[PDB]
Amino acid sequence: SYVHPYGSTLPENGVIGRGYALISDSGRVEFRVTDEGNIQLFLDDSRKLWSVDGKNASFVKMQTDGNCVGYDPNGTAVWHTATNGDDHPYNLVCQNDGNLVVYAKGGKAVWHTNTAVV
Amino acid sequence: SYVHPYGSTLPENGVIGRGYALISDSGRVEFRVTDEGNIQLFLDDSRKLWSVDGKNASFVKMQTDGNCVGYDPNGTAVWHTATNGDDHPYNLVCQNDGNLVVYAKGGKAVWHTNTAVV
Ligand SMILES: OC[C@H]1O[C@@H](O)[C@@H](O)[C@@H](O)[C@@H]1O
Ligand SMILES: OC[C@H]1O[C@@H](O)[C@@H](O)[C@@H](O)[C@@H]1O
Ligand SMILES: OC[C@H]1O[C@H](O)[C@@H](O)[C@@H](O)[C@@H]1O
Ligand SMILES: OC[C@H]1O[C@H](O)[C@@H](O)[C@@H](O)[C@@H]1O
């Protein structure tokens, strides 16, 4: 199982490493970085809503530049939301509806998984 | 070896989990959370300057309340700097001199390991 250091939300400077995850308030939706180096959004520990698999991800960081980035152990980017901007604060939120969202200031969604299935 | 998602410094909302670490600019001083659940500050991968061992630590978080806290996988605190305050921003810095320091605003040291050995 995955440890949850952040509840639902990865704020600026937040980092999820292998074995850690965001978890929805409901408990049903989990955004994991796996020991197998995959970045995966799961419903009910059963349904893979969204993933970046096969790239040896070490961690995901919600950066102070607004970009949300997955890195391998060597610091090479393996995934990014391309959300760079100045509309601070930025947050990555794992929602009860299943959607994983990068919000800019004022609750402005600037990237999402498009997986609001609940 | 330990992945370094933060260089030397754990800012507010920063989290180090098992297998991750802060690293000094010099490369010589590393603040690790181990797979064995220990929180350890090492010089030259050889000399344990400071540690909290035996408590099954899962992660260390530099919190937005100013407190720097080590937690087990169940969210129980196993270590804290007791640095809670309003002098934002707070940062935990792993320095080239060997010292691990919680700084409040303006570079005010409010907690340290007292391990400035280099
Ligand atoms: O796409 C990867 C890179 O994108 C850049 O704009 C920055 O956000 C970097 O921090 C990141 O590593
Ligand atoms: O000592 C443990 C606890 O201390 C409190 O003041 C807070 O900082 C908590 O977040 C923390 O878990
Ligand atoms: O487009 C993003 C938007 O999609 C849905 O409407 C919901 O998941 C919202 O919470 C989210 O902000
Ligand atoms: O007391 C904390 C203080 O100790 C030493 O003087 C150095 O390591 C400083 O960088 C640090 O701020």
UniProtKB/TrEMBL annotation, chains A, B:
Domain of life: Eukaryota
Keyword line: Lectin
Entry keyword Ligase: no
GO MF: carbohydrate binding
Matches recorded under SMART domains: B_lectin (SM00108)
Residues making up the signal peptide according to the UniProt record: none
UniProt cross-references to Gene3D superfamilies, sorted A to Z: Bulb-type lectin domain
Protein name: Mannose recognizing lectin
Origin species: Marasmius oreades
